[PDB]
Amino acid sequence: RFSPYVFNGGTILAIAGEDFAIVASDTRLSEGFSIHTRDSPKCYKLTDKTVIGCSGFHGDCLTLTKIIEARLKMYKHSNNKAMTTGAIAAMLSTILYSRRFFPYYVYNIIGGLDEEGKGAVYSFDPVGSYQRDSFKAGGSASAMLQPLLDNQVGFKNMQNVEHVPLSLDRAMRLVKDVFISAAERDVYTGDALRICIVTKEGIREETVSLRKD
Amino acid sequence: TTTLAFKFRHGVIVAADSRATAGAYIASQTVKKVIEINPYLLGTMAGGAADCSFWERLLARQCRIYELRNKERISVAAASKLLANMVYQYKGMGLSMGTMICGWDKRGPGLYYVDSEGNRISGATFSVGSGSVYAYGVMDRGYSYDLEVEQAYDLARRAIYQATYRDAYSGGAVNLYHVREDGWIRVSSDNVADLHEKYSG
Amino acid sequence: TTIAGVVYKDGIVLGADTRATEGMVVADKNCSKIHFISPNIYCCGAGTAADTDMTTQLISSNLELHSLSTGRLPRVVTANRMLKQMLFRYQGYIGAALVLGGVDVTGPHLYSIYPHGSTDKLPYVTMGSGSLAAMAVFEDKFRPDMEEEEAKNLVSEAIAAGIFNDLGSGSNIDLCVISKNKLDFLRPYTVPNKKGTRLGRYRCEKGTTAVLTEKITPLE
Amino acid sequence: SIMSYNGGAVMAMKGKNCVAIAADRRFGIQAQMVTTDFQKIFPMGDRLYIGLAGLATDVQTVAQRLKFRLNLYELKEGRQIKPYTLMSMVANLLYEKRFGPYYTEPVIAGLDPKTFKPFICSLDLIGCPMVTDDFVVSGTCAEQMYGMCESLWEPNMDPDHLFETISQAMLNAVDRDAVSGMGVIVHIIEKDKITTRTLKARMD
Amino acid sequence: MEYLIGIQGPDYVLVASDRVAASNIVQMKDDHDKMFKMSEKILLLCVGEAGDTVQFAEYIQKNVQLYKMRNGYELSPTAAANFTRRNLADCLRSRTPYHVNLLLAGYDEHEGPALYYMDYLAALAKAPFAAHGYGAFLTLSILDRYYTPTISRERAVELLRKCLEELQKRFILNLPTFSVRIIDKNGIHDLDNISFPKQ
Amino acid sequence: MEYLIGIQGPDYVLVASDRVAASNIVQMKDDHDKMFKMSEKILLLCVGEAGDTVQFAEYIQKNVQLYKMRNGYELSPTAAANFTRRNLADCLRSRTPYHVNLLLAGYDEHEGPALYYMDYLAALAKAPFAAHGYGAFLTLSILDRYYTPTISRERAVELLRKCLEELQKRFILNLPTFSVRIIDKNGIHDLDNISFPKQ
Amino acid sequence: TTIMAVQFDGGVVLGADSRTTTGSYIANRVTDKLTPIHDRIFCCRSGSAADTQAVADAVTYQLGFHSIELNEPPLVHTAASLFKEMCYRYREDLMAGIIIAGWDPQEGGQVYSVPMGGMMVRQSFAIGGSGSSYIYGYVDATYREGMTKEECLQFTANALALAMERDGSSGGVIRLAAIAESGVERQVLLG
Amino acid sequence: TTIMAVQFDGGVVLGADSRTTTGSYIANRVTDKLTPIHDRIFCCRSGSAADTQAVADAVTYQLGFHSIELNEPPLVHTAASLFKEMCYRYREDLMAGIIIAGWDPQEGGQVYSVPMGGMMVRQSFAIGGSGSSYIYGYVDATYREGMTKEECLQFTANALALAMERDGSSGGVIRLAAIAESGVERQVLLG
Amino acid sequence: TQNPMVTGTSVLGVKFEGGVVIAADMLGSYGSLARFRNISRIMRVNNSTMLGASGDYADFQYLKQVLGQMVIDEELLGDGHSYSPRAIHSWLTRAMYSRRSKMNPLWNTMVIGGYADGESFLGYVDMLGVAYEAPSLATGYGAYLAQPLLREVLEKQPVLSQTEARDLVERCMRVLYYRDARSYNRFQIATVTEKGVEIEGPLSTETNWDIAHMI
Amino acid sequence: TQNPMVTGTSVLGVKFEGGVVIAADMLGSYGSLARFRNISRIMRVNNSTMLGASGDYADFQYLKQVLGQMVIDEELLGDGHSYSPRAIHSWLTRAMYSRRSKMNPLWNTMVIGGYADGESFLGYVDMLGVAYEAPSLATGYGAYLAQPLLREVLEKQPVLSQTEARDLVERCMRVLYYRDARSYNRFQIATVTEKGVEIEGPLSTETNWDIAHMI
């Protein structure tokens, strides 16, 4: 009969730096064995230091984005100051549990700066837990991207490899390489790439094309 | 997923792993499972992330309300009772939750075990998770009441190492918390491979 | 998977796309979907790959046997009859979506086979998952008795539209042209999608991995 | 799944003049492991191995059946076997159980008997072959090893960097995997010699 | 349901089953024997659907005795293990499947002791110690804590004593008495029957 | 699953539950207490879905203590038994049913001792001796062989000793320790903890 | 889908649409839905395709072999009996809407109908196909006993026209067949 | 079962069979399938019976009350809107094949159709009922734009004749209704 | 609505230079029976935006009613302010999502086309609430059939004229008449510019069948 | 046959003094569509017995073929011996039971009428093998509808004449035309006597509808 969910796919990445939070996502929105569009950015700029990405079922992504924007305006228009990052994370966790028994079929990744001015990536689950980690890859191409980030960001499973702090342009070449390499094997990934960078001076965006199939 | 807790002469030991999979796929390696409720309570994560996290946060809220109303710190049994009463109101709707509650009491040590099935019981040793039986085995080898401190440290650490060695759904860093009369204290966060090199011989 | 067939003024031009997916992950980037039957008759497969492969090798064996017993060039209708009889004998259990094309003494003859046993003679067919885009290009821009380069451009355009629709291939669309005398077969026809160049260098070093137990075994 | 009953992961990778095949060590029922020394890579003649992943029953059964047919072929003809011949043989053996299928994904990696040409291929559970040039994988975990090998592969590889590349790929994709782990065995072969190394993988 | 343990040593194999033949409420028989002396140095244990156990004992035991009478010598443990695995794997894909969970204990003049490990899906294993059941869980934690490859046989008996004393502590089933064998360069020597008063 | 015997005497009621709180593989707690002192002469036992047992204990225990503080005196066992039956019969036909198995043990100054027997379908019974679980089956024949309405308490303790000694003989579960109460003209007297070393 | 056969005094006249569909997509736009077996006897099919194709091939085999062994032109009732036996034997597995027609030297033009079950009956006109219910609505209104050839052609033309116009599955193009003592006349109409 | 409504220049003409069946047994042999609501507006029903009876009664209630409160003769499109609202708001449990027709002073004769879904459309002719597909086969064949009253009566007579003859559920007796500016003229034919 | 009774079929819409053209056909099939062969499946909203839909026609009548009432209300405000097409798109997306959250979905597939304030707009609303913008939309089987022609020519030519857009729509509707079983040879073209909203008449197609003369 | 495609309807039969009359109609309905409105549902077996059936018409064609061949075989024996109707009844009962024992039943409901050696015979055979003798049989819905009229007149008068039987059959077929949905106003009467076997033509009914002029 009528099924309430459908798998739209998508791939969202986040990298927590020393003083930066890079969030990137493809803009392919598909369904089954078709393509609806080649421009639908999963990223959204909430404040000057907060970018949220939402993948999975698209209508829940739109609804959740608008509700989060409303509650952001409620906190600002009530308490004369913007929210932190962890407050937005806690609030989103309360929302995702507030529809526990009819869940959002949505993966969520919040990147941004803390109050010390450092990078912080808050992952999520469809039901409403979160944790402060250094890097996450959400969506269909999660498993195509997590071990390579374990190899490069974490320097894991290696010997006599020292730990260098992750710079900016190195992280940029990392993001470009992982999206090309993941777009080679995935079916739910390609046609563009919208890279959002959160610094202490604003939000940057960047459009890098990909393969057209 | 494998957690354990046991009380003895010098307080309560709480240890846990940090692996949280998703079906056959591991999500993360550093999931801090022992949820720090208070400066005198420690809650865990035993089956489900969101349910344990949410309901323990709601219990922490309720306990803070209780303390700010009575100017007197809550007991352990009261917290376990409040948790069981709040969890019981969604029975059959599909909540998975098997957490543990640890803390210090007016009576002293307190150790209860609260399920989403509502099996609120007291006791001295408990272990929750898929590979909990391994921890039961090696712990009930090494268990006493009159143990020392570093002996209990070695017991919990060896136990979680054996559990993650046999089970497939467990791994990551071994946290280790210690509940005292005044407050709980994190001991150490030890990786599996470090324990393999140290304890393999 | 998007295969197509057509009949120009002399023979048949077939096309294919070579992304062999296994579930949701691209498992192959180069899979020969155009199979051998005879020096004049070829075949394409879709759906379950090994079923199409084993069936087309059996039927090619049977037609090689019959042609060497007879002593002349095979007919397409015999291949059609064997295929429809076999697939009806399996009662539609085996999923093998086939396109059959060849040039006999009578001329060009194109058949498409649906895995229960329903066959059709057509001037142009499309089969597969993304067959609809190539059938769109065919129904837009087909006319009877085209020339050679015209037909090649049409089939390339159709499979290219199938690649710009979903589940096409990265591959450089395969073509094959059968005439009354001249057989051609062209794997790297047109490459639209170049792989992006590496930006650095994720090269490992001589010793970055701990080794527990070595062994050396000499040979001849 | 039924493929995820006993776990398993087999990787084969073609280098420049040599070829490297690696697999995991873990054996166990769905969540309970038993041992770390279960063999999944078998010698089939010289400079040519095969890897099997999936249900262990079909692994040992198909391995002994294939050894049966292999020795019958190498005794009927004094020469040694070409890898395409072995690929077709495994395809025929799997396709004989079209409706009674084994649950396995065989991976063949071997050299040329006349030249030093490497060879890799993989098959499906009904006998669908697939020859490539870079790498083939099988088992429960797929996307991990696809992401790693599409991240790390180079066309022209000395055997040392080949060993380190397949080492890092197997270690990271196995450490992210749950049901397949507990050590890695690696066979790196060439025209001159045969090397078998075991890595210090995470025992978690 | 229950478990029969199989600890391997340097030059011995320590097997120990139970004596329980219960049916779903009551314990019908408290002196049951699951031990099947194949040859002078080869034992066999069996747990599963208890109508299949006896027919396996008939088939395997008597066909190995037939081999013994045919050629001139005792089987290896390895060929016997493969023969059992082969008959499981052949009888599985039919209208009449077998559902048993085995493990094999043998002794070669050249290979010394050997332990194998089946399943109801015909999987071989060469184990230092293997298990089945729920006692699998409990006995394997204690045994994998306290294992030494160069361990003496009385240490193994003491280890088994300790492991059983922790079996009678957090288990739901009864398991009152365990019988114990050993295999050496001589043959099968039966040790004393191992029960405990609990409290 | 487990067990509680409910022997009625001439002037005493002999109840005895276990101390087992297992969950599906392991015995998590071996000193559990299912005994709920309602008043100075009224006991209550409970077995069922173990999240409902405690909530029933809360409702019944505290509402009986509420009755005691309300009027000035203790309920009869009969009216208390009927109130429990009434709350079962009301709670059954809803969206939230209870699946517990009770029996009630009281003592009146005028009626003397009284034994009742619930079920998961809210049925009253005025029984000479009751039980629950699977040991129920085996044990009531044993008790009904050697029963006398005018039986002394030491005969009842010896009979229960015998009943446990035949419980540890053909039962599949473990049940190592049983706690024992008694009710008299004084009140609730706890007898000694009854365990057996089996072998 | 929609197939039709009308006899008259001299011979018979057949007709069908083409438009073989699968679900909601048209797989093939033009189809030889009616099939020659002998040079004077046709059959037109509906329902599933592979069933009717295999049945028609085996009937062609048996009927050609039998009529060569007789060294006489075959009967129509013979082919109807053959289709009856093969339809009835595997009613558990076949879906045949086979309608037999054809001129005969001994008996003239005849029309037999074999629906999805496997019964055999002689009629003067027949419908068939999922979109045949409508022209089956008015085939007992417009038909007149004792038509000519052109009246049968115009009749079936209007019939298959309205059937193709109304049913969603029906459509495509109109194929006709005229069988008499003289010859076999096939044509492709639109209108 | 089979219901039909045809308009002409002056007014509209309705028609139905009777034969209310349950399973394979006829429970009632003669039935008023078309129902007066107002003195100038009819409706004819299909699907389940009790559903359409309750819906027609509630529409009669609301429409009569509204048209008395207007102190003007009601519209037909209004009643079509009322059936649309009651069918569409609570579909899911009902099976209504309601067809509205009736003369109006402002707009003449009109025919509206409400099928099982709940959509509303104006037509020049309409079918309805399970055995209506056949005469729906040829109602686009025999119809001519701009008939008279007698042509509509003969038209619907042939329609309901063939519908009663062919469908098993249809049958019974013929009921007619003629609505114009002058009056309402109903009649009962048989054989 | 759990089970759609009377469905439409594919709807095509595409922008051009200062306008959006939308064309859909006029068929009301129930199952396989083409029961209602003269219906209107495009609403000409007030002066800027314009709606075309698929799926259950009754639900489209319902949304026609509701949207008509809302547009009438804002036009009776008399403030000189109207609805932008994107506002209508947002309201319709929220409406469909709140329908399906209560497990009572509206079985539709809707296309919103509008031209206001120099910029064209072409929005999509699904039954499940999936909603986006696109330079060319295609619903039902049109996303399988006439979508690659749109994406072919828009890649081949990024800007368009009004004539090229109308001709391309005519060709795509001809193709949909060729191989959709739920299709019909009668369609209407609707066009918005700054000059207003215009609904053209019931056009038809010109077909070819010269492949039928082959065997 | 698991699912009956083309079913008949009720069959009526009743003995009288030296003969058995059987009448069934001529309709071949598929579902509700009366697809084959001119078919024959009574076989006139050689000279004494006679068969009429319901259910799947194809199976009746099959049993017609087999029974025809067996009767032809015994008549070609040339021994002067024929099948008694009770022998036909026995063979058909064993055939249906061995048919249904293999879980592939013949969907029928058969009536065997015969007159041989002074005595009439009228046997019944079900799909399940239920078989008996009766002075009046009624199949399908006839056992619900026209059975009590038969059992009334046989209770009111135990013997009959041919004319009374024929009139009663006409009345019962009229009643079955009134309130069976699967019925049709065209039937044939078949009669056996000592004079042979006779099949009458396609008769019809005379109906009444004067209750329709009531409200």
**In whole angstroms, what is the distance from residue D60 CA to residue E125 CA?**
11
**Cβ-proximal residues to G140 (8 Å cutoff; 6+ apart), any chain:** H162, H165, H166
Domain that holds residue G101: 1-191
Q: Which of D47, D146, D164 sits opposite C219 (nearest CB)?
A: D47
**Chains interfacing with I (3 or more CB pairs < 8 Å):** A, C, G, H
Alpha-carbon separation of residue G36 from B100, G84, G102, G121, G177 (angstroms)? 81, 18, 10, 21, 10
Tokens of G74: 């075959």
Q: Which of G140, G141, G162 sits opposite H140 (nearest CB)?
A: G162
**Closest CA–CA distance from residue B26 to any residue of chain A (Å):** 9
**In whole angstroms, what is the distance from residue J2 CA to residue A26 CA?**
55
Q: Which of C129, C193, C199 sits opposite A176 (nearest CB)?
A: C199
CATH number for the domain including E23? 3.60.20.10
**Chains interfacing with E (3 or more CB pairs < 8 Å):** B, D, F
Alpha-carbon separation of residue A146 from A86, A154, B164, B185 (angstroms)? 23, 10, 22, 33
A-chain CB neighbours of I133 within 8 Å are 37, 39
Q: How many domains does chain F have?
A: 1
DSSP assigned state of H174: E
Tokens of H174: 């013929």
Among G134, G164, G165, G170, the strongest candidate for a mutation testing the H interface, having the largest count of H CBs within 10 A, is: G134
Domain that holds residue D161: 1-204
User: Do J31 and J175 meet the contact criterion of CB atoms below 8 Å apart?
Assistant: no
Domain that holds residue F80: 1-199
Q: How many domains does chain D have?
A: 1
Minimum Cα–Cα distance from C87: chain G residue: G50
Specify the length of chain I in residues. 215
A97 lies within 8 A of chain B by CB: yes
CATH number for the domain including C129? 3.60.20.10
Residue among E111, E110, E127 at smallest CA distance from E119: E127
Residue among B17, B57, B23, B30 at smallest CA distance from B41: B57
Among B160, B162, B167, B195, the strongest candidate for a mutation testing the E interface, having the largest count of E CBs within 10 A, is: B162
A30 lies within 8 A of chain C by CB: yes
G-chain CB neighbours of I32 within 8 Å are 130-131, 167-169
Question: Are D147 and A157 in contact (CB < 8 Å)?
Answer: no
**Closest CA–CA distance from residue I152 to any residue of chain H (Å):** 37
Residue among G83, G18, G85 at smallest CA distance from G46: G18
F21 lies within 8 A of chain B by CB: yes
Question: Are G117 and J58 in contact (CB < 8 Å)?
Answer: yes
Tokens of G68: 């060569």
User: Do G181 and G103 meet the contact criterion of CB atoms below 8 Å apart?
Assistant: yes
**In whole angstroms, what is the distance from residue B8 CA to residue B23 CA?**
36
Which residue type, as a one-letter code, is found at position I13?
A: G
DSSP assigned state of J103: T
User: Given the structure tokens 């033309």, which residue do they identify?
Assistant: G157
Q: What is the distance of C-alpha B86 from the center of its chain?
A: 19
**Closest CA–CA distance from residue I134 to any residue of chain G (Å):** 26
User: Do H178 and H100 meet the contact criterion of CB atoms below 8 Å apart?
Assistant: no
**Cβ-proximal residues to I25 (8 Å cutoff; 6+ apart), any chain:** I9, I41, I173, I176, I183, I184, I186, I187, I188
Q: How many domains does chain B have?
A: 1
Q: How many domains does chain C have?
A: 1
Question: Are G168 and I213 in contact (CB < 8 Å)?
Answer: no
Q: How many domains does chain J have?
A: 1
Q: Which of E27, E170, E197 sits opposite F170 (nearest CB)?
A: E27
Minimum Cα–Cα distance from A125: chain B residue: B50
**Cβ-proximal residues to A7 (8 Å cutoff; 6+ apart), any chain:** A56, A57
3-state SS assignment for residue C149:
helix
What is the residue-wise DSSP string for C60-90? HHHHHHHHHHHTS---HHHHHHHHHHHHHHT
**In whole angstroms, what is the distance from residue H101 CA to residue H113 CA?**
8
F-chain CB neighbours of E179 within 8 Å are none
Within 10 angstroms of residue B153's Cβ, the number of other Cβ atoms is: 17
Which residue type, as a one-letter code, is found at position C202?
A: Y
**In whole angstroms, what is the distance from residue F181 CA to residue F192 CA?**
8
**In whole angstroms, what is the distance from residue D2 CA to residue D179 CA?**
13
User: Do J105 and J4 meet the contact criterion of CB atoms below 8 Å apart?
Assistant: no
Minimum Cα–Cα distance from D144: chain C residue: C25
| Residue spans of beta strands (DSSP E) within chain D | 9-14, 19-24, 27-28, 33-35, 41-43, 48-51, 107-111, 118-122, 130-131, 135-139, 184-189, 193-199
Tokens of F61: 């225990």
User: Do F185 and F11 meet the contact criterion of CB atoms below 8 Å apart?
Assistant: yes
Question: Are H137 and G133 in contact (CB < 8 Å)?
Answer: yes
C22 lies within 8 A of chain D by CB: yes
- H or E segment at J133? strand J131-133
**Burial class of J162 by CB neighbour count within 10 A (0 to 12, 13 to 18, 19+):** middle
**Closest CA–CA distance from residue J178 to any residue of chain H (Å):** 8
**In whole angstroms, what is the distance from residue H148 CA to residue A83 CA?**
78
Among G34, G130, G164, G167, the strongest candidate for a mutation testing the I interface, having the largest count of I CBs within 10 A, is: G167
Question: Are B91 and F51 in contact (CB < 8 Å)?
Answer: yes
CB half-sphere exposure, A158, CA atoms < 13 A? 20
J-chain CB neighbours of H24 within 8 Å are 141, 180-182
Alpha-carbon separation of residue J202 from C197, F32, J22, J138 (angstroms)? 88, 89, 13, 20
Question: Are C129 and A33 in contact (CB < 8 Å)?
Answer: yes
**Closest CA–CA distance from residue D137 to any residue of chain C (Å):** 9
User: Do J142 and J134 meet the contact criterion of CB atoms below 8 Å apart?
Assistant: no
**Chains interfacing with B (3 or more CB pairs < 8 Å):** A, D, E, F
Which residue type, as a one-letter code, is found at position J46?
A: N
Specify the length of chain A in residues. 213
Question: Are E197 and F195 in contact (CB < 8 Å)?
Answer: no
For residue G189, report the phi and psi dihedrals to the nearest 5 degrees: -110, 160
Which residue type, as a one-letter code, is found at position B108?
A: G
Question: Are E144 and B162 in contact (CB < 8 Å)?
Answer: yes
**Cβ-proximal residues to D191 (8 Å cutoff; 6+ apart), any chain:** C219, D17, D18, D47, D111, D116
**Closest CA–CA distance from residue B116 to any residue of chain E (Å):** 22
**In whole angstroms, what is the distance from residue G42 CA to residue G80 CA?**
11
What is the residue-wise DSSP string for D61-101? HHHHHHHHHHHHHHHHSSSPPPHHHHHHHHHHHHHTTSSS-
| Residue B49, annotated as binding a ligand | yes
Resolution in A: 4.9
User: Given the structure tokens 């000059």, which residue do they identify?
Assistant: I195
B-chain CB neighbours of D4 within 8 Å are 24
G-chain CB neighbours of C88 within 8 Å are 50, 53-54
Among A8, A156, A180, A213, the strongest candidate for a mutation testing the C interface, having the largest count of C CBs within 10 A, is: A213
**Closest CA–CA distance from residue B127 to any residue of chain D (Å):** 18
Question: Are B136 and E141 in contact (CB < 8 Å)?
Answer: yes
H146 lies within 8 A of chain J by CB: no
**Chains interfacing with F (3 or more CB pairs < 8 Å):** B, E
Residue among A100, A129, A92 at smallest CA distance from B45: A129
**Closest CA–CA distance from residue G6 to any residue of chain C (Å):** 27
Judge whether B21 counts as a catalytic residue: no
Specify the length of chain B in residues. 201
Minimum Cα–Cα distance from E27: chain F residue: F170
F-chain CB neighbours of B120 within 8 Å are 54
Tokens of E87: 């008959």
Starting at the edge strand found earlier in the chain, the sheet holding I19-25 runs I136-138, I11-16, I19-25, I187-193, I196-203
Domain that holds residue J130: 1-215
Q: Which of I152, I171, I211 sits opposite C161 (nearest CB)?
A: I152
CATH number for the domain including J98? 3.60.20.10
User: Given the structure tokens 């209300």, which residue do they identify?
Assistant: I73
| Residue spans of beta strands (DSSP E) within chain I | 11-16, 19-25, 42-43, 49-55, 108-116, 119-125, 131-133, 136-138, 187-193, 196-203
**In whole angstroms, what is the distance from residue H1 CA to residue J32 CA?**
12
Minimum Cα–Cα distance from B132: chain E residue: E137
G-chain CB neighbours of J38 within 8 Å are 123
Question: Are E25 and F172 in contact (CB < 8 Å)?
Answer: yes
Residue among E102, E136, E105, E107 at smallest CA distance from E121: E102
CATH number for the domain including H74? 3.60.20.10
G-chain CB neighbours of H136 within 8 Å are 134, 137, 166
Alpha-carbon separation of residue A210 from A207, G113, J192 (angstroms)? 10, 61, 90
Residue among J52, J128, J126 at smallest CA distance from J85: J52
Q: How many domains does chain G have?
A: 1
C-chain CB neighbours of A161 within 8 Å are 208
Q: What is the distance of C-alpha I177 from the center of its chain?
A: 16
H22 lies within 8 A of chain J by CB: no
Question: Are H21 and J181 in contact (CB < 8 Å)?
Answer: yes
Q: CA torsion C18→C23→C24→C25, rounded to 10°?
A: -60
**Cβ-proximal residues to F124 (8 Å cutoff; 6+ apart), any chain:** F81, F82, F85, F116, F117, F118
3-state SS assignment for residue F3:
coil
Tokens of B152: 């209990």
Domains and CATH numbers, chain A: 1-213 (3.60.20.10)
Which residue type, as a one-letter code, is found at position A156?
A: K
Q: What share of chain A is helix, strand, coil (3-state, %, to 5)?
A: 30, 30, 40
